[model samples]
Target: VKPNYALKFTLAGHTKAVSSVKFSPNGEWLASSSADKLIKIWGAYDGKFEKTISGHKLGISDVAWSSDSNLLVSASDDKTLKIWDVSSGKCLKTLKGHSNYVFCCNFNPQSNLIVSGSFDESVRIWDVKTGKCLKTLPAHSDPVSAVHFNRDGSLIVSSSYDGLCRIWDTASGQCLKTLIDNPPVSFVKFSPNGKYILAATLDNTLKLWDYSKGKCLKTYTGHKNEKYCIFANFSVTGGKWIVSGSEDNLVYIWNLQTKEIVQKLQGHTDVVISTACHPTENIIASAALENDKTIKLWKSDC
Candidate 1:
């Protein structure tokens, strides 16, 4: 049966490339980051712009919400991370340590810790309250592209331009496993079940792996991803689908079980770099680069 996917609405607020988009854990706010040095918040379901968060001295690279949805954190080219109060739209704390651009950041499941990947070729963990760096792991040989905490916060996974994905013990800050590929991995995330990992490589591929067995389980194609850190995600609606932005100017969604291209969303005129899945709805939000400068919402009525 068809999922009956269609464009629900479009949003424009950023004047430059939109780098990241994410939905709050509480399923109320959608947050987006742009090279224009701002983060915009919107009503998760209605796509209505609500607030613009600004404080970074340079372009923002990524944004992630705390598990409680009361706070948001942003990584920026200014080489720092800032925690913002969601309700008041004010900077709560500024975390500084990275000597280069901070490309990706994510709050641990407990919401008291944060993991950040930086161009300095390291992954740093920070304490949420004191805004102090707790541990710095020399993670990759090249610039670290993305970092994420596993579902339970016991483990952390990081990807790098070094062409590797490494898993770490969050509490001990030890490299537990290294998943290797010849192509540079731009993005990575642990499955909701915490049994597998999904990664995007510059070779234009999305690969699923059994990290415990150290084996590739499935590979997804049919989208352009040779440049930029294009992000892909497991759908929050049910985890049966994977969605991603493409350098080819389309959003491709695949059926996770069948490995079939189920939908190609067309509307953006430029590369779509990031996408987010609504925590409890069959909806997706995709953000594009300089030319498009828009965030689009799509829905599926199965």
Candidate 2:
């Protein structure tokens, strides 16, 4: 079936290139970070900028909303992660420990913990309420690109430029499994049911792993260049789909069951840095960096 889609909104406010964008878990709002050193929260429907959070000393690299959608967390090149109260637009906490650029971060499934990956080659876990560092994981030799908690919140997966994907036990800070030899694994995520780990690599391939067996199950190759990032989510009613953004300035959606490219989205004028799917809607958002200073939101008939 041919699906009909359109651009629901174009959010233009960042003075510099937008780096990352994320939708709240409930799909009520959107949070974006940019090189302008600002994080803007917006109404998901109207594209109205609700609050502009400005405190980072350098460009904000990434931003994520809490599971409850009441708080937002941002990581920056300034080597720190900041938490903001969405309602007041005030800085709630400042996590200061990373020695180098903080590139990516994500809230735990429970929303009580936050995990951050940094150029310092370390991953830090923090308690959201206490604003205290709980554990420090030293594994990657190069900068870490992505860090995320699994669906059950029992395991945390991290990818780094060192060409490794590591799964860690959240409570004890122990390394559970390591998938080695994957060149510059940029993003790693768990399936919705927490049964599989999917990783995107600089080698321009996607690999799926059986976490229990610690074995690579499948390898997917399509991007002409490096696959910078990837995300997988179940449809609103429940069906698995995987979408990836690459350095080739393109986005591809794959069917999980069939392992086929279902749709190839092309509209960005520059390298697509990041993309996000709405929690319960047929919408996908993407951000690019070059001459453009805006984030494009696309509606899809999935």
Candidate 3:
């Protein structure tokens, strides 16, 4: 996860702040959502502008791609989630359930279901084909910031402002485990190998957990993550490095092997909200707040 020099390109389109960004399944397309109520898709390889999927009335908080990469689902501040066909600019379905802002959404790896967390303190599981909410869990006392499905789709993890992260059984919708966060978990996800859980906290640190044992394995400290729903993810380099953006206006890369800050990327003029590592390439993309409102691509000549 040691990507080198070069501001490969800047995705400049959104009129307002970019809040969420993601690379599509198979890494052929990249999509970003902003406060301008727009979602733009781009060619992953050439960075060419693809299509603008518009519908949300307010800021879009998050977007998730279906397993096959043909469809995308977005959660918005307008209290709705819309699923769109990426092949066309048509929105296929509008999922309505949350009474408040929808903060995060993710498709199960099996791609048959959708999982979302909302500011209404609820987590909903949806059947993709039917667009029906299969179950709703009043998951937290405070806002539920993030929800993610495990590799095999057998488990789901959610991070909440209640200072907790919980693991749930995907089938029975039962709480299997709870990992307490001292500073409130902003984001949480299963490692690529399904061996660990990465918890990004509002405390400005990243905690790695052994989910099965409910124990903290390690903590990677280096980044100011306290502002927005700051997210971090693993690089495709055998999950060897961790990449994340911060309130410090820089993208920080942590060496998982040494648990140290190995690189600090400086370019953004304001707080960086999120970052995405290409699933198959030696590249990473990061976005900043309205001050910058742009996504920058990072890569090396290697």
Q: Rate the local accuracy (lDDT) of all candidates.
A: 0.92, 0.81, 0.86
Q: What are the per-residue Cα lDDT tens digits for candidate 1 across 34-130?
A: 9999999998888999999899999999999999999999999999999999889899999999999999999999999989999999999999999
TM-score to native of every candidate shown: 0.98, 0.93, 0.96
What's the CA error at residue 48 for candidate 3, in Å? 1.5
Mind giving the per-residue lDDT tens digits that candidate 2 earns over 1-302?
32333677778898887888899988988888998999988887778878888999999989988988999999999999999999898889999999999998999989899999999999999999988999999968999988989987888989899988888999998998886554788788787788888888777777778888888777766754465544433333234566666677676666666677767677776677777878887887777775666777777665
Model 3, position 13: C-alpha lDDT score: 88
Winning model by TM-score: 1
lDDT of 2 at 285: 79
The per-residue C-alpha lDDT of model 3 at residue 225 equals 73
Residue pairs that clash (backbone atoms under 3 angstroms), model 2: none
Q: Which is the winner by TM-score between candidate 1 and candidate 2?
A: 1
Best by lDDT: 1
- Residue 39 in candidate 2 has what lDDT? 92
Cα misplacement distance, residue 182 of candidate 1 (Å): 0.8
